[PDB]
């Protein structure tokens with residue numbers, strides 16, 4: 740469980756993210772797709788993209804980054820009490836989109852990297868550690884729902 744001090748670190752950097760949700764979502768998805776090309780393939784919307792420049796030029800990719808980061812921000816602000824927010828997400832991701840937990844680990848890495856690049860002064864090691872714990876908690880809870888569903 741995260742402590743109150745850890746949640747404060749998480750939400751302090753997250754408030755910086757929310758000044759530019761779309762730009763952060765672009766950066767995160769591009770990093771994910773470049774670092775882990777199998778993830779791109781899960782998106783019929785995006786698997787035509789062949790280059791970073793094409794990814795950066797795609798308005799639809801920017802829209803999905805907003806969708807993803809909006810959902811994550813709503814989860815983070817629940818400070819662990821995110822059961823209702825995870826139910827639909829775990830269901831769609833296990834049974835429709837088919838996103839392994841490992842791919843959630845990869846996007847978590849991408850989130851952390853982009854937050855460190857964009858917000859170094861608010862993303863020292865303490866805050867990195869807290870955000871890693873928050874994203875682990877997310878993954879843990881989704882994983883339990885996947886297991887229930889046999890995914």
Ligand code: HEM
Nearest residue numbers: 778781782784806807810811827828831836838842843846
């Ligand atoms: C922080 C982690 C993530 C969050 C919060 C998140 C959130 C969302 C949301 C809110 C939606 C739309 C509602 C829904 O279908 O449930 C969605 C759709 C989707 N997401 Fe996730 N997502 C995350 C990670 C990923 C990863 C890592 C992948 C792939 C590697 C992925 C693949 C997809 C796909 C394929 C869709 C459907 C897109 C479409 O065809 O419109 N997501 N996601």
